[PDB]
Amino acid sequence: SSVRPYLEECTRRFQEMFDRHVVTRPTKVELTDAELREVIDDCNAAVAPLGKTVSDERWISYVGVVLWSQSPRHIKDMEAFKAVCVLNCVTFVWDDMDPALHDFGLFLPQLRKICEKYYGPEDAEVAYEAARAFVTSDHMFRDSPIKAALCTTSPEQYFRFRVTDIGVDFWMKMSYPIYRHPEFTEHAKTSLAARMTTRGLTIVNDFYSYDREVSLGQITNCFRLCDVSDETAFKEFFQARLDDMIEDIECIKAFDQLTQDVFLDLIYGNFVFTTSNKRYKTAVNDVNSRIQAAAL
Amino acid sequence: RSSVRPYLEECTRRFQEMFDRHVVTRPTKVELTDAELREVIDDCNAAVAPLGKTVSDERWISYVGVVLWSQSPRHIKDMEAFKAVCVLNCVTFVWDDMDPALHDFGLFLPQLRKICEKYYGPEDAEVAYEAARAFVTSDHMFRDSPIKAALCTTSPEQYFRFRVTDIGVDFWMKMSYPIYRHPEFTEHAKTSLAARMTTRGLTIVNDFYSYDREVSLGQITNCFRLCDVSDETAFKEFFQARLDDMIEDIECIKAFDQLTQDVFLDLIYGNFVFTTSNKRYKTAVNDVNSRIQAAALEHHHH
Numbered sequence: 054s055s056v057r058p059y060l061e062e063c064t065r066r067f068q069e070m071f072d073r074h075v076v077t078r079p080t081k082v083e084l085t086d087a088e089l090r091e092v093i094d095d096c097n098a099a100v101a102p103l104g105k106t107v108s109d110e111r112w113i114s115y116v117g118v119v120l121w122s123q124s125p126r127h128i129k130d131m132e133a134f135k136a137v138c139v140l141n142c143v144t145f146v147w148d149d150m151d152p153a154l155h156d157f158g159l160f161l162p163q164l165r166k167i168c169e170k171y172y173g174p175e176d177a178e179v180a181y182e183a184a185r186a187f188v189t190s191d192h193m194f195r196d197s198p199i200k201a202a203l204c205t206t207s208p209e210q211y212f213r214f215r216v217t218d219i220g221v222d223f224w225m226k227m228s229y230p231i232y233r234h235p236e237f238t239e240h241a242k243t244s245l246a247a248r249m250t251t252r253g254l255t256i257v258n259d260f261y262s263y264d265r266e267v268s269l270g271q272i273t274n275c276f277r278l279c280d281v282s283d284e285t286a287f288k289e290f291f292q293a294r295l296d297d298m299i300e301d302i303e304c305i306k307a308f309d310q311l312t313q314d315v316f317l318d319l320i321y322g323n324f325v326f327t328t329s330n331k332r333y334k335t336a337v338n339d340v341n342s343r344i345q346a347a348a349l
Numbered sequence: 350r351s352s353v354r355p356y357l358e359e360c361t362r363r364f365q366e367m368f369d370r371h372v373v374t375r376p377t378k379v380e381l382t383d384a385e386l387r388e389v390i391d392d393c394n395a396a397v398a399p400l401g402k403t404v405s406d407e408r409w410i411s412y413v414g415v416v417l418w419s420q421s422p423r424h425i426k427d428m429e430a431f432k433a434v435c436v437l438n439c440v441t442f443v444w445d446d447m448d449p450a451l452h453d454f455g456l457f458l459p460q461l462r463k464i465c466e467k468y469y470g471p472e473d474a475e476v477a478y479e480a481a482r483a484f485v486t487s488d489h490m491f492r493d494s495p496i497k498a499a500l501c502t503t504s505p506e507q508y509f510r511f512r513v514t515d516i517g518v519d520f521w522m523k524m525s526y527p528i529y530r531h532p533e534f535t536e537h538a539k540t541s542l543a544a545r546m547t548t549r550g551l552t553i554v555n556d557f558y559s560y561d562r563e564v565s566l567g568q569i570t571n572c573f574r575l576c577d578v579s580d581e582t583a584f585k586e587f588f589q590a591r592l593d594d595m596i597e598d599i600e601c602i603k604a605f606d607q608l609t610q611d612v613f614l615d616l617i618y619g620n621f622v623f624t625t626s627n628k629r630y631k632t633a634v635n636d637v638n639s640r641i642q643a644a645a646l647e648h649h650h651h
């Protein structure tokens with residue numbers, strides 16, 4: 054199936070939800086041309102050992118999510134920002150890669166290289182460990198019975214899987230050096246930061262990446278828990294997910310002012326990234342195609 | 350002065366029937382040698398000594414029972430790592446029981462590091478230390494925090510999300526994986542998926558048996574504060590939803606690899622046996638579970 058029928062009303066329902074509960078719109082980070090090419094050179098170098106080329110356009114697509122979903126008001130360290138740019142893009146290639154291409158012995162050293170270039174010694178270890186856990190999870194769970202069980206049982210089992218699998222725990226553990234805000238750093242390191250933002254990021258991503266994933270046999274998507282064919286059941290389910298996002302956003306506002314800005318800019322920036330970026334406008338295209346092995 | 354006392358017998362039997370149906374395999378208590386117990390307690394005294402409060406041998410042994418009951422003795426390979434978890438868990442229980450006036454990070458974090466460096470190799474010691482640091486920093490950070498009030502009063506979902514860290518199960522997995530040297534378990538511990546899978550089963554059990562103590566101390570971190578426990582109908586409907594939660598988690602746990610699921614279920618079932626047998630949960634206020642308090646005249650000359 055597909056959710057294109059619902060695409061227009063749901064975008065509006067999302068946007069109305071954000072306009073009431075978040076209000077402040079996200080704003081896109083503009084990189085200088087130098088900065089952008091540093092990022093892209095760093096990206097190509099990290100995936101090169103894996104034997105696949107990535108166009109400058111596919112990198113700019115990936116990087117949009119970081120340009121839209123950080124918190125410019127509070128940025129203090131732009132070297133850390135660039136690291137998140139590079140780390141997020143290259144793990145995007147991994148997510149799209151056939152597992153045959155997953156070579157840990159070749160790719161884990163490049164991840165460490167990136168982390169040691171942009172972070173101090175401590176932050177580099179934190180970012181690296183989170184990058185390593187993320188690519189290792191994506192690998193381990195292709196065709197895992199665990200993934201099956203967690204994705205088909207209930208929303209509560211599914212979002213639990215997604216704390217790691219969608220990459221938000223990774224994101225927080227590499228983004229906290231951007232802000233050098235002590236409270237935020239601690240919520241990143243306990244993963245409470247990821248836990249608070251997982252549903253807002255996943256429900257949005259799931260709706261707009263449903264068609265791609267479903268075409269590719271990918272089960273990691275909460276709308277597979279309902280009959281998107283049944284208009285009534287889809288509406289009941291969509292509302293419960295919106296309810297989920299609203300409850301999360303309202304608790305987020307108990308966090309200190311800077312932390313809540315970063316959390317809410319992330320959820321909302323990701324919705325803007327996802328509704329505008331080319332990755333999510335069609336199932337298979339030049340920036341979201343499966344990176345295939347190609348046998349012989 | 351609310352209480353779940355009237356439900357104690359039926360609730361305990363309902364928990365037990367749930368384990369008999371869904372887990373089946375019983376936990377087994379790890380027996381420590383007299384030497385091993387003494388190394389642990391000596392190491393606990395050393396670590397807390399800089400904080401100026403004495404902890405009795407009886408109270409240590411109370412704390413240590415959860416590790417003796419809730420690890421997975423079928424699969425223990427590293428007893429040095431086992432001893433570290435005994436020590437780390439006991440001394441962070443003390444911290445959990447302490448007035449925050451007593452919380453000296455400068456004094457206590459290096460003692461946590463020393464324990465980790467004693468029992469673990471270098472990489473493992475850093476993972477255990479970081480988890481330990483994160484736990485005591487969370488417990489301290491959230492004493493009368495408005496974030497805790499929001500997460501704990503809003504819904505079960507928000508509450509259990511706070512408890513992944515706050516009950517200490519993430520810390521437990523991240524200091525326990527060296528015991529087993531099992532690769533899948535190690536990865537699940539490092540992603541926190543292991544903690545996430547076991548949070549509700551540990552939290553619901555603990556919350557029921559520590560409710561009376563916690564309401565009496567003003568402590569709001571307990572899911573049964575989300576319902577009117579003096580309302581039998583509302584309590585039983587809430588209790589049954591929490592059993593459903595435990596059952597759903599247990600059944601997904603059984604999709605994990607066999608060793609990992611043995612470890613996950615021994616933790617949840619072992620914690621239930623520890624909780625329903627240990628003096629700590631026998632009464633709300635006693636000499637193994639009383640608040641460890643600072644003295645307002647601790648600085649005095651008499």
Ligand SMILES: [Cl-]
Nearest residue numbers: 270271272273
């Ligand atoms: Cl998938």
Ligand SMILES: [Cl-]
Nearest residue numbers: 567568569570
């Ligand atoms: Cl509390």
Ligand SMILES: [Mg+2]
Nearest residue numbers: 148191218219
């Ligand atoms: Mg993925």
Ligand SMILES: [Mg+2]
Nearest residue numbers: 148149262266
């Ligand atoms: Mg994907």
Ligand SMILES: [Mg+2]
Nearest residue numbers: 258259262266
């Ligand atoms: Mg997706």
Ligand SMILES: [Mg+2]
Nearest residue numbers: 445446559568
């Ligand atoms: Mg306590």
Ligand SMILES: [Mg+2]
Nearest residue numbers: 445488515516
């Ligand atoms: Mg506590």
Ligand SMILES: [Mg+2]
Nearest residue numbers: 555556559563
């Ligand atoms: Mg308790």
